[PDB]
């Protein structure tokens with residue numbers, strides 16, 4: 001708030017990963033400005049996620065005390081005790097982004113979400129007997145990686161695109177060719193500017209094995225067609241962590257908001273400086289605390305995502321409605 005210039009959020013309940021995700025989205029400047037320009041004039045008071053998300057971001061940018069999220073949770077109706085224990089973190093990122101993306105249709109910033117988090121991949125099926133291949137284009141906003149028996153992110157990506165053999169009792173129904181031996185896999189067509197990677201650490205029991213991830217991650221090796229104009233080099237932006245015996249822990253997140261390597265810890269309402277080692281290597285696991293989700297930004301688009309945002313980037317109409325609500329509380 002004063003020691004770092006950043007204000008955290010107060011844990012109003014058992015929200016688990018929620019507070020960690022909000023700070024990550026808030027420091028996605030390119031995404032932040034898009035939400036400020038959302039037409040939320042005649043939206044419901046406390047029944048609109050886009051509006052309720054706008055308020056949080058504004059209070060985060062201006063307020064000097066810990067920010068609250070009570071109104072936000074009720075926005076999407078997760079007020080039950082076990083609400084968060086029955087949902088993955090990416091499920092909330094998808095729930096949040098889908099609501100704002102729909103509310104942004106037809107404006108100047110429509111489609112901003114796919115521009116930042118949307119990527120293209122291809123799932124296929126190839127058989128060695130005949131010559132029938134079936135490809136399927138798909139879109140992805142978050143990537144679920146496996147970490148059991150995986151040393152680092154490199155091996156995890158290798159297993160993600162690894163080919164699977166459909167033979168023996170798992171032969172592929174080649175349609176007119178009957179059961180056939182084939183192999184199935186997936187390939188990465190493109191990588192979005194902002195990369196969200198969830199680590200499969202909750203396979204009903206938390207696993208605390210050691211998993212390594214670098215500050216700079218080159219992903220050109222996993223693309224179908226490389227582009228010398230823009231390499232697939234990504235920079236670590238945020239690290240969400242958790243420590244606990246299978247059912248409860250302190251949810252902390254590490255961030256370098258400007259992408260300059262100056263990291264900070266966000267224990268809800270307590271924001272403080274920290275070393276890059278405490279944010280990266282100290283969260284590999286092996287202690288007993290380990291990260292469960294990573295955020296990477298394309299090196300070429302780092303300045304675009306983290307562009308500077310001032311108080312002039314918020315419409316005057318929204319500022320009054322937000323100030324009028326805060327003032328009305330007085």
Ligand SMILES: C[C@@H](CC(=O)N1CCC(O)(Cn2cnc3cc(Cl)ccc3c2=O)CC1)c1ccccc1
Pocket residue numbers: 016017084085087088089090144198199200201202203205206207242246247248292
């Ligand atoms: C208490 C929870 C925190 C929490 O409630 N959650 C749900 C779990 C997470 O989404 C990570 N995760 C874990 N396992 C997966 C398995 C498959 Cl198959 C696909 C996706 C995932 C995945 O995303 C994080 C958010 C936790 C358990 C274990 C380790 C760390 C945290």
Ligand SMILES: [Zn+2]
Pocket residue numbers: 090093094141142196
């Ligand atoms: Zn996400």
Ligand SMILES: [Zn+2]
Pocket residue numbers: 250267268
């Ligand atoms: Zn704390």
